[PDB]
Each structure stands twice: as structure tokens, then as C-alpha cells.
Design a protein around this motif. Sequence first.
Motif: not given
Lengths: 98, 122, 175, 88, 55, 49, 140, 115, 347, 54
Positions: B26, B71-72, B75-79, F28, F31, F35
Motif C-alpha cells: 500500500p 500509522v506504523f 501499514y502492516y494491518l493493510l498489508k 518513521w 517504515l 516500504h
Amino acid sequence: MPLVYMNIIMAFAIALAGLLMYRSHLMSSLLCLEGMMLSLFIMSTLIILNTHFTLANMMPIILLVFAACEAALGLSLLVMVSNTYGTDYVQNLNLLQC
Amino acid sequence: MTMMSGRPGRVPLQFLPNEARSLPPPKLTDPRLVYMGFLGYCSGLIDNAIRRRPVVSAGLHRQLLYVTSFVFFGYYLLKRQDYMYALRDHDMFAYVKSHPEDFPEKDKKTYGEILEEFHPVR
Amino acid sequence: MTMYIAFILSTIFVIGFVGFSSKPSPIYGGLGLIVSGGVGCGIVLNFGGSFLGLMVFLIYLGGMLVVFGYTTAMATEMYPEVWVSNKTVFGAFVSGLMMEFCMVYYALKEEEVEIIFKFNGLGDWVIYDTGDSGFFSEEAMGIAALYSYGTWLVIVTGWSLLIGVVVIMEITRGN
Amino acid sequence: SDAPPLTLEAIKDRVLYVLKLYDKIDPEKLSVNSHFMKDLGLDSLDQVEIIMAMEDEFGFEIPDIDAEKLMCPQEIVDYIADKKDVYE
Amino acid sequence: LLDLIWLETILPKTTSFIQMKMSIMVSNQKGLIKLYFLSFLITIMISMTLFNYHE
Amino acid sequence: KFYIREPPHGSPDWLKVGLTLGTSVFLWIYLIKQHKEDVLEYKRRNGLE
Amino acid sequence: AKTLLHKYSDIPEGTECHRKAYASTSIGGATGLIVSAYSIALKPPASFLEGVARTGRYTFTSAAIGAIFGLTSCISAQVREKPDDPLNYFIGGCAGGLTLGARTRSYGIGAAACAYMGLTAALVKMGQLEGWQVFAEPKV
Amino acid sequence: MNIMLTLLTNVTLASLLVLIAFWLPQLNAYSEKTSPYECGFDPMGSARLPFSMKFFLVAITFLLFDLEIALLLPLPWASQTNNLKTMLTMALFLLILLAASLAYEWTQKGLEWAE
Amino acid sequence: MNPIIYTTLIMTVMSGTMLVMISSHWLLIWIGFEMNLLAMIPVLMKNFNPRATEAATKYFLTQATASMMLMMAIIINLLYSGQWTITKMFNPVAMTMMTMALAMKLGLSPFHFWVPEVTQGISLQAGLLLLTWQKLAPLSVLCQISQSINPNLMLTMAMLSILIGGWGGLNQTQLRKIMAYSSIAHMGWMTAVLPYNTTMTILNLLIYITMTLAMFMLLIHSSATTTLSLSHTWNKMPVITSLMMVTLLSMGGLPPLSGFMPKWMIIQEMTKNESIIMPTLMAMTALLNLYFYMRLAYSSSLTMFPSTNNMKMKWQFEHTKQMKLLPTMIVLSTLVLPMTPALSSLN
Amino acid sequence: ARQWQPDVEWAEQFGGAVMYPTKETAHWKPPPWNDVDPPKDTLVSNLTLNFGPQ
Ligand SMILES: CCCCCCCCCCCCCCCCCC(=O)OC[C@H](COP(=O)([O-])OCC(O)COP(=O)([O-])OC[C@@H](COC(=O)CCCCCCCCCCCCCCCCC)OC(=O)CCCCCCCCCCCCCCCCC)OC(=O)CCCCCCCCCCCCCCCCC
Ligand SMILES: CCCCCCCCCCCCCCCCCC(=O)OC[C@H](COP(=O)([O-])OCC(O)COP(=O)([O-])OC[C@@H](COC(=O)CCCCCCCCCCCCCCCCC)OC(=O)CCCCCCCCCCCCCCCCC)OC(=O)CCCCCCCCCCCCCCCCC
Ligand SMILES: CCCCCCCCCCCCCCCCC[C@@H](O)O[C@H](CO[C@H](O)CCCCCCCCCCCCCCC)COP(=O)(O)OCC[N+](C)(C)C
Ligand SMILES: CCCCCCCCCCCC(=O)SCCNC(=O)CCNC(=O)[C@H](O)C(C)(C)COP(=O)(O)O
């Protein structure tokens, strides 16, 4: 099945009914709990011996250990209840309603 | 009642199988990630309000940590969610392909040759 | 068919269960439970479980001695009740006895599914295995396996026992 | 719920019942205005027994100073009404 | 007759009355474990017969 | 103004503030790197770039 | 037991009114017995005879409701020559509701029981006709 | 088979001794003779009154420590296993917790009787 | 209680729950339940009083009976098949015993009588633990054996739980009994969908746990256990009352709040299985839970009740102890509806 | 003119041990402010013993 299996199962059922039906003494119900445990021990031992499942010969011992834990817990609670009221009657335990 | 827990070749406690790496990650400006950051900001503001601190300005480092953590994790939840939906679609298509006799292709008729009943409104 | 010894022992087991389940004074309840433990020890002995039956007899003897002490401490009345000193206790005892009688009769004289399934009887000797080998007792080997196979069981059991000691001390503190 | 709202008539009936159950009193010569010492000829000790019977009947204790004043069934009824807060 | 009495009676007041009666019935328990475990025995007897015999 | 300790005094706890800021910055950066690696792996697996 | 429900449902709708009425009476009696058992368990009747009386009143009321419902529904279905019609079940349900209201001796209870029991019976008939499932199997 | 006969013989002998003791001698029972004994006098209260137990906490611990025996009695058979290191580790582990449970109740005044 | 002892007991409760979670052997699951109960009993009695003693005694009796039934069912299943693995029980009678045992452990109707009394008799921290952590193990066991359950008995118990939860909560002025009846209704909702989709049960569990944690923490922060005591919080902490009102609306299942999503997903999943009547009754009955939530919100935040003179002294003092996760729990209890498709990660 | 707010009489509706008070539950009393009931005068009688003369 053997008729001994029915006898042990009815022993469990009778002890369960005895627990579920309460008279004045709290102690009587603890004895019914211990009777259910004894019937469970006998039934499990008979099943394990009949099928020659070697490794569960230790399982009833664990059952007995946790039975002792349950009995100790019940006796401690009975001690506190009787210290509160001077009697182990169940009808004294009615401070809390639904 | 348990659909995909028994799927073959499923490692128990990964949360992210290696096959998920074949999917596009994402974007970092994904609106769902922005919503997770907004949730973290709301958590920071509520934390300020409960402790009787100035709601908007009291804890800037704490609010930054709140937003960053939300946010951190998001991100992994969405993945994981995208990977699970990809697995669902993959299994569905494979099953449809392997069982043609249960999903037949019947010829479709044009509307000039299909007779529909007319119900006048009056 | 052959002497139906285990049938009699299990019937006495049920009789003792009815005895302590009708709930007379806890003295007589403990007496009934002791009788049940002894006859269950005999039952388990008749199928080759010497260690398990004897151990459950020992454990329940200790438990019932503690229960007798506690009954004298905190469960007494001016007139302790017996199975014939009260209409409710006597009625429960008679009802249990006749229920067991009805179950046994309907069990051996015809074949009915009481609750789970049916059975004809034929004595316990039929379901045996006639296995012929060994310089050991398989029950003893299986029980001794607890220290080599059942490490996890030993760990959880020991933790539960220590926690039980801590728990009884926490409960009986008061204040 | 608990007992119904006890009234004066029930109190008076119970008092006359417990007095008529007392063996040293004539069942028909006893009235609500009869005087124990003069009307019934009862001794002071007899009166104490009557007060004790009232305490058993109505389930509450009576001090001696109140009991010494109580010289007729009507006074007993009035005292019980006052202690139990009954107007009718 | 209609808006203030009968339309009130049918939909909202009937619902309020029924729910109040049912709440009073359900929640007014004496707090005695004897009655609760008797009901537990009754429930067990029913599940083993009206449900456990039907499969 | 205030009479007693008032554990938050005129100066803030610099250890706690520094730890919080460092945690945010590390998260950050981790992350961002994750990504980038995910994008590169996805491209390499499917033969895009 | 659902065997009682099958014994009720094995009889055709507009045929054998006495048998269907008997089946509905048995269903009502079982329901009343269960209700009385729970009522005795949760609220002691302070005496054995009072408990017997409460069991009798509950069981008789429920059995009467079932009998009236079954008899009225079967009779209406056979007279109207209209099987597979929710109106017969509605009529029987209102008859049972009036029976309950007469038993409790309350006009409002009678009217409310009429309306609600009739609507419920009509809904049950509709579900039988179109195959609605209450405890649906886990198909997917 | 033999053990049942032995138990029957012992119980029969004891019951027969009771019967002989109760039917052979002359009996003269009256109320004063059969009354409860308290060394010169009538008891004030009943012997069925609650009798306080000052060692109630040790009685509960005895229940848990008695099951320690059940877990430890198969030890002679356990010494015949091949993996002696595992059995010795678990056997020593079980006794260590039993020793620690005793130490906990000792240090928290659990072995002292109620006053 | 010594803090070390309390920590050990909480860790023992959690370890028993995890033992139930990770076990493949029925005996180990029974052992986990036994250890959980043994360590749980003292926690209910941490603050000693006769009410706490009575609550602990009732809890012990109920859970011991459930454990006996559990073991008896395991033994029957072993008798009719020499199996110890928790995959799918081979006997209908043993499975019925198992269901009744797990329902008694969860407090489903008609085994619900113990939940309100035990919850009322203990402190707010013990109530939080009892109503959040104690549900995980039996629900996990039921999830593992979902394919074997009889849908009729499970759905009957779930519908009874919802109805009785609503009716019982309608009559309460004590906050702990309100939360207990709410818990009963939520357990009924969770067990209604279990025969169809265990992921829905897990999602409902997570959302209910989040809302219950937020509500109990808000009740601890404003140290009230009755409706009238909570009526005073507006004159000391209006923000707490506003957050409480929003959380109460979320617990009622109103959109667009979080509490609506589990009911929505359960209804749609049940409709996938041609189940229409029962979800309709379920929502129409959860209307009662919403009603008593709204009554609490009326008494707590939307109107201002009279206060006392001594509140002025309380105005001068802050809270000495602060709850770290309260802010996060409130946000998750309210603003997570747009993140619904994330439930696929739960399966 | 000001917005109406609840007063003592309105607030007292929620002060009872239970809502919707019936005849049986009218005698129910709300639990104590702290969860502590007052101790009961259930005096445990000591055992009296005749030690001697015999
Ligand atoms: C859907 C799409 C998106 C929608 C968004 C969702 C809704 C909004 C977000 C929700 C969460 C955010 C805020 C939560 C934390 C705030 C807590 C609080 O109390 O606020 C106090 C605080 C004011 O206090 P203060 O400034 O410290 O000094 C005054 C004193 O404290 C004096 O204060 P006091 O405490 O002494 O006053 C007492 C008061 C205290 O009572 C309150 O303050 C109420 C607070 C309730 C918290 C909300 C619940 C949690 C969130 C759930 C939201 C649900 C939404 C769904 C719909 C349902 C509606 C309920 O109590 C009362 O008066 C009784 C009121 C009871 C009536 C019932 C109504 C209450 C509930 C209503 C909630 C509605 C939603 C939140 C609305 C915003 C509220 C700030 O409010 C703020 O100043 C912060 C508000 C937001 C500012 C940040 C904006 C960023 C700046 C601009 C950057 C631009 C960004 C984009 C870039 C563009 C490029 C340029
Ligand atoms: C593997 C899982 C399976 C497990 C299950 C298997 C279990 C087998 C074990 C059974 C063997 C016996 C074991 C002994 C247990 C010890 C019990 C005990 O300690 O008593 C404590 C308990 C209280 O102890 P307490 O404090 O010393 O006494 C105080 C006074 O009782 C109270 O003082 P009060 O006089 O002031 O109170 C008024 C009076 C009030 O008494 C009453 O009002 C009850 C009388 C109602 C009459 C019933 C109607 C008669 C006709 C109905 C027949 C149905 C078919 C009709 C067909 C159409 C008719 C034309 O007493 C009561 O309140 C007590 C009510 C409890 C009655 C029995 C409980 C059963 C459930 C409640 C429902 C009542 C019947 C409704 C109908 C239900 C369906 C038949 O004693 C009793 O209450 C009764 C005495 C116990 C003897 C009977 C026990 C046998 C029942 C066991 C289960 C039944 C069968 C099981 C399986 C069958 C099929 C497989
Ligand atoms: C109110 C919103 C819900 C909040 C939920 C709590 C959030 C905090 C939890 C902290 C996150 C860490 C948990 C997991 C990280 C590593 C563990 C990982 O390995 O677990 C895997 C599994 O991953 C986790 O289960 C996923 C957890 C993600 C929870 C979020 C879903 C919430 C639903 C939608 C609402 C959006 C929430 C927004 C986030 C704040 C194991 O897979 P598996 O062993 O095979 O499955 C076990 C269950 N089975 C077998 C029965 C299937
Ligand atoms: C179970 C078997 C029990 C048998 C044993 C009982 C033994 C107990 C004996 C105790 C004796 C005492 O206490 S001795 C009591 C103390 N003194 C007196 O009795 C004499 C002085 N009293 C008066 O003269 C009054 O005027 C009076 C005449 C009462 C008139 O009373 P009214 O005009 O005001 O009614």
C-alpha cells in the motif's frame, strides 16, 4: 457397553444432581463435587485399562491432583463463609441479587 | 465456520507469509493510513483532555508518537488484509477453473428474443 | 455371567453415591464417600489397576479425614441428620435406590438406550484382551512415563500445587 | 412484602386473646376497660406475667416503668399503638 | 381519542408495559443459589432430552 | 506560584522527551525503508522494473 | 421433543380434527409443564400442595390453549375448504388467545392474546408454506 | 479371591466378638447409668456444638501435600527409564517446589495455630 | 495482598488462559481451565468483605460444576473414540455436555444467574477482568469445535441470552449489574454467529472487549458504582461524562459508531445462510440494551443532576493515578467503523 | 426563563435498589456506600467443660 460403565455413569449423574439440589449445608455440596470427581476417575481408569492405552495411565493422577486443588479451594471458601456467619448455610449467601 | 485457517501450507504465527511479497505494498499516502493517523491524533487529543492539559498544544511529542504508532501498525494491518483478500480471490478462481461442471457458460439471449412480462402502472 | 463380582461392586458404588448425594450430615456423607472410594478401588483392581485404585483410596481417605475435621469444626448441628431422620433425605435416598433398580432391571432383562446407547450385559469378562507377555505391569510403566514423557504435565501440575498453597493462604487471610 | 399494615382492631383483638388465654381471668367478665388489680382482682406479680405475655405476643420488649403504668387492656393497646406508630 | 389515547396505547405504551413487566419478572431473583442450581438441573434435563435425542 | 514540588517544574523532562522523539523518528525511518524494500521486491518478483 | 411437532404435522391440515386437537393439546401441556417447573424452581411455592396447584393451573391453561387452537384451526380449514391458508391459523390463534384471556379473566389480556397469538400462528403457517428456517443450517 | 475371604473372615470374627460381648453378660441398663459422662456432673451444652479447629490452615495444606505423594510414588519405576537425566531433572524439580511451598507457608506464619 | 502475589496470580490466570489457547490435548485444556479458576478465585477477594466472599463462592461453585461437566464430556468422547485431540467430538451426547459446560462457563442463558451477582459483589478492577479476560478461553474452545455444535441448542441459548440481558438490564440502578447484563447480551450475540463464521465471533469479541475496557476504565476514573453517584461526575469531570455518553451510544450499536459493525456483519453473515427471522429478532431485542444505555446517558451527561457542597473541595485535586490506555480504548470503541474491511486479517 | 434541569425529586427515582419498584422489592435496601456490610452479632459460644472432680 459393559453394565459397569452404566453404573459409573449413573454414579456421576446422581452426584451431579446432588450438587445441583441444595440443602442447608455448604459442606454437603463439596462432597458431591468430590463424588463427581471420584466417578470421573473410575470411568477414565476403566476406559484406559480396557483399551491398553499405556500413556494415559498418568492422566487420572493429574485428575486427582486438580481435584485436591478444587477441594482445598472449596474448603477455604467455606472457612471464610463460616467465619462471616458462624454457619455454613447457603441461605446466608443472599446479599447479592440479580 | 472456519474457512481459511486450515488452508494447506499455512504457517501458524507469521502474520505475513512470504507469498505476500508478490503483491504491491500500500502507498504511504493511502487514505486508510491517513485515517489511522487521524485516529492516533484523536487519541492524543483525548489523552490531553483527560489529563486536564491544553488539548491542542500540550503534548507535541506524545501526539507525534501517537500518530506514528497508529500509522506504523496500520501499514502492516493493510498489508495483511490485502494479502488475505488476494488469497480469497486466488482460491475462488482456482476452484472455478478446476470445477467447470458446476459453473457452466450458457449462451445469453438478446432482449429482443427474451420475453419479459409487462406490468402497467395505473 | 461369571460371578458378576464387578457388577455387585459397581452397584455398591452407586449405592454409596446415592448415600452421600441425598446429603445427610456430612459425617455420614463422608462415610458414604469412603465406602464408594473403597468399592471403586476394588473395581479398578478387578481390571488390573492396582496402583490407581489403591492410590485413589488413599487420597480419598486423607481427604475425608480432613472433611471430618472440618465438619466437626463448622458443619455441625444440634441433631445431625441420618438417612431416616428426615422426610426429604429419606425420599431422596429411596428415589435414588429405586432409580438404580429400574435402570439395572431395564438393562439386563431387555436392551434399551437409556441415555447414550444400549447394552445387553454378558459380564465384564467378554471385553478382555487375553494378551500374554511381560516382566512388568503396563499400568506401572505408563504411570512411570510421567517423568520421561510428561515433562509438560509435571511442570503444570507443580505450578498448580504451589499456586494452590499461595491461593489458600490468600483466601484465609481475612482482614 | 412484609406483614400487612397492622391496625388498632387487630392489636385489641390480640390483646384480648392473650388475656383470655390467661388462666386467672374470667373469659366473659373481662372487658377492654377492666382493671387488673380492681376489676379482675389480679396481684402485681400476676400483672408482670401478663406484661411478659404481651411481650411474647407482640415481639418487642417492654421496660418496667412503662409496664407499671399499664393497668388495663386499653392502656396496653394504647402503649403498643404508640410504640408501633399506629393511628388507626 | 386517537392521537392522545389509542395510538399511544397500541404501539408505544403497550411496548413499554410489556418490557417493564418482563424486566420485573426476569430481574427479581432472591439471590439464592439453591433456586439457580435447581433451574440449572431443569435446563440440563431438557437439553439432553429435547435436543440430545434429536440428531 | 505553586507551594510544593509540582513534579513538572519550569523545565520539561528531557530524557523522556528525547526518548519519545527518538522512538517516533526510528519508527518513521523503519517504515520508509520497509516500504522501499517492499516496492523493490514487488517489482523484482513480477518483472516490472 | 420435536416428535410431538411431527405427530401434529403428520396429520393433514383439514382432516382428522380430533387427532390434530389431541396433538396440539399434548404440545400445550408439555409447554405448560416446562413453564411450571421453571416457575417452581425459581419461585418456591412455600408448600407442596400450592406447588401442585400452580403446576395444575399452568398446565391446564396451556393445554386448553393448545386444544382450542388446534380444534378451531382444523375446523375452519375443513369447513372453508381452504387448506394452506394462514387465515385458519390466525383464527385458531385468536381463539387460543380468547381462551387464555378467559382463563386469567382479563378482557385486555384476552384481546392482546387474540391479536398476537393469531398473528404468530399466521406467520408460522406462512413459514411452513414458503419454507422459512428459524434455526438455519450452516450452508455457507 | 483369597483377599476377599480373608477380609470376610476378619470382619466376621470381629462381629462375632461384638455379638458375644453384647449377648453373654447380664444387662441392667437404667437412665443414670447410660447418661453422658463429664466426671461428676451433667454437661452444660451439647457435644454436637461447633468445636473450633485452630489448625484449619494446616489441614488444607495437608490435602495439597498428600497429592505430592501420588506424583512421587511411581519414582522407583521411573528410575528404570533410559533418559535418566530428564527423569532426575523432573523428579528434583517436583520436590523443590514442594520444599518452596513449605517455605512459603512457614515464613508467612501459616504453620502457627490460630489464637 | 502483596503486590508480588497479585502479579503472580494475574500471570497465572493469563497462563491458564494461554494453556487453553495453545493446547491440542483435551486434558491440557481442562488443566488450563482449572489453573485459571484456581488463580482467579483470590483476585475476586482482594478487597475483603462478605459480598466479595459470597461472589467468590458462587463463582467457584458455578465454574467447578462446569468443569465437572467438561471432564465428563471429554471422557465420553474418549470412550466412543480413543481420541484426545480437540478436532471434532464424535458423540452427540458428549458434545451436548461440552456445549452446556462452555455455556455455563461463559454465563449464557439460562446459566446467566451468576454473572450479575458476582459482578456486583466484586470491585471494578475485578469486574473488568471477569467481563473481559474470562471469556477468551471458552470462546476459543467453542471456535475449535464449531463444526460439531448443534445449531438448535446454541442458537436457542444465544437468543435467550440476548432477551434476558436486555430485560435484566432494564431494571438496574447499579452500574456493575448493568455491565453484567450487557455482557450477557453481547455473549448471546457472539454465540449466535459461531456455527456460521468464527471470524465474526472473533471480531465481535475484540470490539466488545474494547468497549467494555473503555467503559470500566471510565467508571474507575469517576469512582462511582451507582447511577446517582455517576450523576455527580458532570460537576467535577465533564469530559469524562461526555466520553462516557459517546461510548454508551457506541455500545448501543448506533451508526456510525464502532458497536454497530459487529451486529451489521453478524446480520449479513446470517442472511448469507438463509437466516432472516432470528437476526431481525436479535436487533429488535438489542433495542432494549440501547434503551437502558440511553437512560444512563440521560442521567449522566445529557442533563445536569443536583450536586453536593463538598464537591468544591474535590475541585482542587487532580487524579493521582492515570490510566495509560484509556484514550486509545475510547477511540477504538468509537471511531473505527471506516476500517471494517480489516476483518479479513482475522481469518 | 432558563432550561429545566433535574431536581432532588427527579433524581430520587434512580436512588432505589431497583427500578420499577414492586411490592416485594420495596423492602430491598440499596447496598452500603462502600461494599462493606456491618458485622453480625453471631457470637460463637465457647465450649464449657467439667474438668474434674473425678
Ligand atoms: C465524519 C467525518 C469527520 C468527522 C470527525 C469526527 C468528529 C470530530 C473528531 C472527534 C475527536 C477529535 C476531538 C477529541 C478530543 C477533544 C476533547 C475535548 O474535550 O475538546 C476540548 C477542546 C477545548 O478545550 P480547551 O481548548 O483545552 O480549553 C477550554 C477548556 O478546556 C474548557 O473545556 P471543558 O472541558 O471545561 O468543557 C466541559 C465540556 C467538555 O465536553 C467536551 O468537550 C466534549 C468532548 C467529547 C469528546 C468526543 C468523543 C470522542 C470522539 C468520538 C466522536 C464521534 C463522532 C461521530 C458522530 C457522533 C457525535 C457524538 O463538557 C460540557 O460542556 C458538556 C457537554 C455535553 C453535551 C453532549 C455532547 C458531547 C459529545 C459530542 C462529541 C462530538 C464529536 C467531537 C467534536 C469535537 C469535540 C472537541 O477542544 C479543542 O480545542 C480541540 C478540538 C479539535 C481541534 C484540533 C483541530 C486541528 C487544528 C487545525 C489543523 C487543520 C487540519 C487539516 C489541515 C488542512 C490544511 C490547512
Ligand atoms: C448426565 C446428566 C444427567 C443428570 C440428571 C440425572 C439425575 C439422576 C439422579 C436422581 C437420583 C436421586 C439423587 C438424589 C438427589 C438429592 C436431592 C436433594 O437433596 O433434595 C434437596 C431438596 C431440598 O432440600 P431441603 O432444604 O432439605 O427440603 C426443603 C423442602 O423441600 C422445601 O420446603 P417447602 O415445603 O416449604 O417448599 C415447597 C415444596 C414445593 O414442592 C413442589 O411444589 C414440587 C411438586 C410439584 C408436583 C409436580 C406435578 C406432579 C405430576 C407431574 C408429572 C409429569 C407428567 C404428567 C403427564 C400428564 C398428567 C396427566 O418444596 C419445594 O419448593 C422443592 C421444589 C423441588 C421439587 C423437585 C425439583 C424438580 C424440578 C422442579 C419442578 C417441579 C415439578 C414440575 C413438573 C416438572 C416435570 C415433572 O429436596 C427437595 O426439594 C425434594 C426431595 C428430593 C427427592 C427428589 C429428587 C429426585 C429428582 C432428581 C432428578 C429427577 C429425575 C432425573 C432423571 C430422570 C430421567 C433421566
Ligand atoms: C476496536 C478495534 C479492534 C482492536 C484490536 C486490538 C488491536 C491491538 C493488537 C496489537 C496488534 C498485534 C497482534 C498480532 C501481531 C503478531 C501476531 C500474529 O502472528 O498473529 C497472527 C494472526 O494475526 C492477527 O490475528 C491479526 C490481528 C489484527 C486485528 C485487527 C482487526 C480488527 C477488525 C477491523 C477493525 C480495524 C482495527 C483498526 C486498528 C486499530 C497469527 O495467525 P493465526 O495463528 O493463523 O490466527 C489465529 C486465529 N485462528 C487460527 C483461529 C485463525
Ligand atoms: C424449675 C424450678 C424452679 C424452682 C426454683 C425457684 C427459686 C427462686 C426463689 C427466689 C426468691 C426471691 O428472689 S425473694 C424476692 C425479694 N423480696 C420479696 O419477695 C419480699 C418483699 N416484697 C414485697 O413485699 C412486695 O410488696 C410483694 C409482696 C411482692 C407484692 O407485690 P405487688 O403488690 O407489687 O404485686
